[PDB]
Amino acid sequence: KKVVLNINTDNMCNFASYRLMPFSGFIVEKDDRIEINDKNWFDMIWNEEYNKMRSQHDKIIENIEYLFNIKILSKNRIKEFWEEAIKYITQVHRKNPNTGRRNWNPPTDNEIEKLYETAYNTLLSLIKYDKNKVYNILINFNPK
Amino acid sequence: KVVLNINTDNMCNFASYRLMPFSGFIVERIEINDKNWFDMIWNEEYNKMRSQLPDMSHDKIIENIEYLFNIKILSKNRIKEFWEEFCKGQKAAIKYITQVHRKNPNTGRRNWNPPEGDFTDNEIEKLYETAYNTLLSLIKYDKNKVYNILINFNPKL
Amino acid sequence: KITFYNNSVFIETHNGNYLFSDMPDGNVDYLILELIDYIERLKYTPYKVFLKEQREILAKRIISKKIRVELPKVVLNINTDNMCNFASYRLMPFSGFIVEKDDRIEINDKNWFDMIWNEEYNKMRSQIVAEDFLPDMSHDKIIENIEYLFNIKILSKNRIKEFWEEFCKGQKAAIKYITQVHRKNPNTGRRNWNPPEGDFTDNEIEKLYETAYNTLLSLIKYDKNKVYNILINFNPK
Amino acid sequence: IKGILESITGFSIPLDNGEYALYPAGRHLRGAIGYIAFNLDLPISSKFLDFDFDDIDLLPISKCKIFYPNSLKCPSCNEIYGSSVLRNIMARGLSYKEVIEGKKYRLSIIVKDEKYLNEMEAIIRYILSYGIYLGNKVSKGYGKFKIKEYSIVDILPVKDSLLLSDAIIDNGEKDIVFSKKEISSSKFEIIRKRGKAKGFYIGYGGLGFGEII
Amino acid sequence: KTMKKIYVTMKTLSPLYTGEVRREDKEAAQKRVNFPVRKTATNKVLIPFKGALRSALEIMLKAKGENVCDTGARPCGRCVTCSLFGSMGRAGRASVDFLISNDTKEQIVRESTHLRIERQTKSASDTFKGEEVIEGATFTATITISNPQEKDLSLIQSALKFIEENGIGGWLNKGYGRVSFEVKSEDVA
Amino acid sequence: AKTMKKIYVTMKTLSPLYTGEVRREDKEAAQKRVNFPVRKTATNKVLIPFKGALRSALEIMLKAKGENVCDTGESRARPCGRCVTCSLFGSMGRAGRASVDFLISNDTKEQIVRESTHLRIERQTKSASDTFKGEEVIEGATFTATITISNPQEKDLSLIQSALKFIEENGIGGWLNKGYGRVSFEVKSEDVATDRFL
Amino acid sequence: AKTMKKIYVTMKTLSPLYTGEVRREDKEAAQKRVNFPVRKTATNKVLIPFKGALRSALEIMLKAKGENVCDTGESRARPCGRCVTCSLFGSMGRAGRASVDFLISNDTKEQIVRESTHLRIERQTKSASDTFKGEEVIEGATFTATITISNPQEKDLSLIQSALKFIEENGIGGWLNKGYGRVSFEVKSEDVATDRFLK
Numbered sequence A: 001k002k003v004v005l006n007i008n009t010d011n012m013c014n015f016a017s018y019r020l021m022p023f024s025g026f027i028v029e030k031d032d033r034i035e036i037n038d039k040n041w042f043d044m045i046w047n048e049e050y051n052k053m054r055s056q057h058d059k060i061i062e063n064i065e066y067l068f069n070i071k072i073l074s075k076n077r078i079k080e081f082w083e084e085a086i087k088y089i090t091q092v093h094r095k096n097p098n099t100g101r102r103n104w105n106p107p108t109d110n111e112i113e114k115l116y117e118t119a120y121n122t123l124l125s126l127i128k129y130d131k132n133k134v135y136n137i138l139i140n141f142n143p144k
Numbered sequence B: 001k002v003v004l005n006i007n008t009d010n011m012c013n014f015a016s017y018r019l020m021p022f023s024g025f026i027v028e029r030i031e032i033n034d035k036n037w038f039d040m041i042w043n044e045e046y047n048k049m050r051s052q053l054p055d056m057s058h059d060k061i062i063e064n065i066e067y068l069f070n071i072k073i074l075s076k077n078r079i080k081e082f083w084e085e086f087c088k089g090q091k092a093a094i095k096y097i098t099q100v101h102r103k104n105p106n107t108g109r110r111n112w113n114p115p116e117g118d119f120t121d122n123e124i125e126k127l128y129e130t131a132y133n134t135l136l137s138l139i140k141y142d143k144n145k146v147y148n149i150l151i152n153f154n155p156k157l
Numbered sequence C: 001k002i003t004f005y006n007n008s009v010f011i012e013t014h015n016g017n018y019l020f021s022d023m024p025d026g027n028v029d030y031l032i033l034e035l036i037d038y039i040e041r042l043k044y045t046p047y048k049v050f051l052k053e054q055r056e057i058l059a060k061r062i063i064s065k066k067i068r069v070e071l072p073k074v075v076l077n078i079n080t081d082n083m084c085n086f087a088s089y090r091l092m093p094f095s096g097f098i099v100e101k102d103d104r105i106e107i108n109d110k111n112w113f114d115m116i117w118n119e120e121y122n123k124m125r126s127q128i129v130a131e132d133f134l135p136d137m138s139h140d141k142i143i144e145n146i147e148y149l150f151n152i153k154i155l156s157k158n159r160i161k162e163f164w165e166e167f168c169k170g171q172k173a174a175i176k177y178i179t180q181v182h183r184k185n186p187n188t189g190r191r192n193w194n195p196p197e198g199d200f201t202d203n204e205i206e207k208l209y210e211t212a213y214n215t216l217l218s219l220i221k222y223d224k225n226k227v228y229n230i231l232i233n234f235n236p237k
Numbered sequence D: 001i002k003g004i005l006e007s008i009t010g011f012s013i014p015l016d017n018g019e020y021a022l023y024p025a026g027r028h029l030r031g032a033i034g035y036i037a038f039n040l041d042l043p044i045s046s047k048f049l050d051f052d053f054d055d056i057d058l059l060p061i062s063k064c065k066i067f068y069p070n071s072l073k074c075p076s077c078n079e080i081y082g083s084s085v086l087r088n089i090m091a092r093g094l095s096y097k098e099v100i101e102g103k104k105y106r107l108s109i110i111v112k113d114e115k116y117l118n119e120m121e122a123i124i125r126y127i128l129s130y131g132i133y134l135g136n137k138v139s140k141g142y143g144k145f146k147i148k149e150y151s152i153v154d155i156l157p158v159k160d161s162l163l164l165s166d167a168i169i170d171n172g173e174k175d176i177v178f179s180k181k182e183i184s185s186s187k188f189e190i191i192r193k194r195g196k197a198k199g200f201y202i203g204y205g206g207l208g209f210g211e212i213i
Numbered sequence E: 001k002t003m004k005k006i007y008v009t010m011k012t013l014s015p016l017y018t019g020e021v022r023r024e025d026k027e028a029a030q031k032r033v034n035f036p037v038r039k040t041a042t043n044k045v046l047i048p049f050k051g052a053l054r055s056a057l058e059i060m061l062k063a064k065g066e067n068v069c070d071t072g073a074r075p076c077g078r079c080v081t082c083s084l085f086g087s088m089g090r091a092g093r094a095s096v097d098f099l100i101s102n103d104t105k106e107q108i109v110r111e112s113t114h115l116r117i118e119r120q121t122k123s124a125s126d127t128f129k130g131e132e133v134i135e136g137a138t139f140t141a142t143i144t145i146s147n148p149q150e151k152d153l154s155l156i157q158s159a160l161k162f163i164e165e166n167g168i169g170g171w172l173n174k175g176y177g178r179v180s181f182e183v184k185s186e187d188v189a
Numbered sequence F: 001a002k003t004m005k006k007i008y009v010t011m012k013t014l015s016p017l018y019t020g021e022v023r024r025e026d027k028e029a030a031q032k033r034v035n036f037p038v039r040k041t042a043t044n045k046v047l048i049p050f051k052g053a054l055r056s057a058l059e060i061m062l063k064a065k066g067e068n069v070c071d072t073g074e075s076r077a078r079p080c081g082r083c084v085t086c087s088l089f090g091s092m093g094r095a096g097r098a099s100v101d102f103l104i105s106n107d108t109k110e111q112i113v114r115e116s117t118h119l120r121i122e123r124q125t126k127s128a129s130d131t132f133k134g135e136e137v138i139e140g141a142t143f144t145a146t147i148t149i150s151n152p153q154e155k156d157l158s159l160i161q162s163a164l165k166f167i168e169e170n171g172i173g174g175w176l177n178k179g180y181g182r183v184s185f186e187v188k189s190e191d192v193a194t195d196r197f198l
Numbered sequence G: 001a002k003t004m005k006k007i008y009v010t011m012k013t014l015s016p017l018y019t020g021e022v023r024r025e026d027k028e029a030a031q032k033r034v035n036f037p038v039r040k041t042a043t044n045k046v047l048i049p050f051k052g053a054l055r056s057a058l059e060i061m062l063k064a065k066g067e068n069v070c071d072t073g074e075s076r077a078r079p080c081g082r083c084v085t086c087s088l089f090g091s092m093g094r095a096g097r098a099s100v101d102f103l104i105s106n107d108t109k110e111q112i113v114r115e116s117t118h119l120r121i122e123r124q125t126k127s128a129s130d131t132f133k134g135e136e137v138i139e140g141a142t143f144t145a146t147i148t149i150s151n152p153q154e155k156d157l158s159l160i161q162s163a164l165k166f167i168e169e170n171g172i173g174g175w176l177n178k179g180y181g182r183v184s185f186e187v188k189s190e191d192v193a194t195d196r197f198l199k
């Protein structure tokens, strides 16, 4: 079969009048058309096959004032809550069983866990409140 | 033009493409060709500047290496060291296998690992000769075939 | 310090005493050029003179006068000795390799390239493996077995991650991975499993390894959507 | 001029009411070649400064042919374009939007008289060696556009009664805005018109604005 | 008139970080990498290079003694950096390209883990993943200067040496972005 | 602003040095052979993170001396912006004055990096229960770095040198408790102006 | 916190010391001459692992005493983090406060390193059935190590000294059954400040 180099020949050496080059490419049979392509090629198709396998109320506002005052319920939190939300809030409060690392912000340790719980409560309740009410509530706290 | 100058065997099937990992030399009538060209060219010009095997079947090779691996005549240190001398050429592998197999005239002790079991003297020497003939005939094969043969017995070759 | 003489520059540095060509009185470490008398009249005979072909014949005279004569990235040698003497030239019949780094250029032999070719061969071989890209239990039993081996840390998040990567590469690659992981070593007696936490003996530990083997074997027969919904609960990434 | 331009780097082209042009217009090609022509001393710069010269838009091309009319559907393949191509950029206190690069666009510069061709061929040579920069933030590296092909084919005008680009006629519901920013005059004007909607060439505001397909 | 075209070849010596700015591509990449590198849709790497040149010239010309505005304030329009790298009104003569890589993403861009270690406990308190460019990765640019002057190549090369010593892109204090810039000037008339 | 501080750091290893590979692609390529690869360049030279070690040294020393110095070591801890290491190394708003380069080796991986065998031995039967291969940088291998301080102060160099002697006392890189990473630093400082290039 | 403990140990060798070479390329260079190379630096000085010996000594004695100590010697065993040796030598969530340096010889190679011959003899015949060559460290060679205890306690120096006497009793590394590695220790400790470098 006809054989085509996809490799770059624009780097060479001259030894014994032979224009040689050490190379580490892969030879591919493709339907009576053989080719020898580089490592990048295999990187690209390994990525393509991986992506193909990958194709499958006043107290609430006062709690937000306290929490944003010590910045545990900060601006990106308010944004990503707006971007949303129950599964999000579940995913940003769940304590890691190995390290005990809740994904909130740092603000005693008992007060820290109470404040963390306070956030989960306030975050869950505000999603209970309808849109616009929370939206307005959240604008003067983080305008975005 | 392309002349591949390599065996197009050992073709695995990643995804829907029959690939085959390779490392060789492109030489310009362009001709991709393997490490044997570099051995030939290196010997040729290195001496031009100095001017002032047994053949046993592949199934029987695999079965005998499996048998000697179970009774610990061939071990992971031996399969790795023989692979290192096989990468150094087909003449260093002959020297290494001859050095391991040889009976020292004063002691009579071959450098193989002794078998594990209840084998008598003639059976032990027959298995030593089996290891010699098997690793001697294995060299007659190419690097990829040698690699697929010994990669089962030693997974970190 | 730069003095003068009859055209002579006499630049003194901290390293060496150059003289570009009356003669001076100090040491003229490097001299740059009847002149033999100009050499012989000059105190502290120079180390190495810096001298169209008549030059070379003159240099032979400078060679005979017992004076060194030169006729007009750091490079290191990783070579041998061998040596030879042909046509008044100490030689070496060697062919090799010029390796270019950021600061050094080194001259290496073919043995270093064989070292590099062995490494590149061993690198290439461990990229393409087999056909990249069974028992059976119920789905809920698979859930409680993965929960139980997660609690006792036999099946960990890293093991679930490599299981998902070997499952995306296909069925046979994942079969090879679990048969490698559950491989009891005949000369050592350990498998490639995380040992469970808890007060256990050898029999229930071996049984738990067997149910880990059977659970990860029976999960392979399921499709990718069920396996993804089975393993996100334990490994969220 | 028949050719294909590849967006090497993305371009940002803002419009009023919040939106961005989904591809570069012919006014931007006209402006950028006018900037190159003043920077090369070629005598076409006074014609550029004139805004009613016919003597001399960039629509995306498809997997087929050219996309036709904010979405632009393909004629044959019926592939869809638009609102999957715009991308938001928040960079150092600025929030703009751009188009992802790596996409291929048409060439439309049709010289009605032969007398300036050489001139047009000359600036195409500059583009063929250096590239044209269309859009906002031109000096920041944005808006690069290489040429992949170049040829010259004469064209007879329309012999019919659609508007691929936009048009300027009477009073319209839509609103089109272009500008004039004259170097060596210190003058910039965001000039306003209304025009019609989309879907030779002119009609009827400018040469590099109207299109009849 | 004449114009000056400077081809900037760039070799990477220490790993390069330029944060991705495309929001949809960022949030497509945030499930895996917390700091995606600035990437094209042609899978190439973008580096802003007019800001680094302008800032280098501003600090160097300010510490020399010349009257140059400091951005970080509107441009004055009368200084050297306003006549070269732009002012609100007068456009800049020096259009400076993005530093486009000659290679694609899969050869030069790697996901790398970075830490935050507690000082007393001496364990990894925090963790993140950021994309970075490998070293030896070659980037190309061409900058175009219309109506050049005598002090045109020297200012560009001096700002280029300031970027070699200081770095380009983000994470500059940690050692990221230390590059070497070769050059190639030509005059087009 | 008219002057800058250039600290050329030449560091040699008295103990074997390990720092861990960070690139995932490089690390997953390396575990087919080795379990703990050393962080290297794509130009095969060894790289060590350096700003974190100097910053951690200054935080521990300055906290133990008694200055009002914030701690950025804890999880998601915020720098205050008032202490001397916030001014010297970085703050949440103001950038760091010291642009600390990476520790770039002079030699490549074939000269200084060597793969070795580490163990885990049972205490009762005295047998090697586990075994793993890890790369390390050899002893006497030299590394170069450059610390560029813009807007310098009088006491910045004393702080950097004190942090360097603390890194000699503790170690740099990983596996510091097992004896790895003990180093010796040479310092060449100099005052420059910023318009040497001009 | 404010202070840290410095424990300088100077260990002299009484019976010959072997600690095996770890580097695979240094091994493969040295197996053409010596079957058992000694652990060595690139600056030709002998390296000995020290943290594992002290840790294993403390776990063995504190387990025999009956104290709550985990074992980190079984296969893939993880430290709990609540023991007494878990504080000194580390756990999964916390590092060890006692950073223990490698034992590095004051002399160099080719001065304390001596290559020797070892035997295996038939019991029925009394003939040298096997022979190998191993690289040892001579007796009287002096090694120097430092232990930096970051957060000192009252019982750290006593625990370190007790582990040192156990290393004297058992041997430090290598063929400890045959009699190799029997050493003795000299201890000099001081409570230095953490801010001593801040002049």
Ligand SMILES: [Zn+2]
Pocket (backbone or CB within 6 Å): E068, E069, E075, E076, E077, E078, E079, E080, E081, E082
């Ligand atoms: Zn200005």
Ligand SMILES: [Zn+2]
Pocket (backbone or CB within 6 Å): F069, F070, F071, F079, F080, F081, F082, F083, F085, F086
């Ligand atoms: Zn602070």
Ligand SMILES: [Zn+2]
Pocket (backbone or CB within 6 Å): G069, G070, G071, G079, G080, G081, G082, G083, G086
């Ligand atoms: Zn414990």
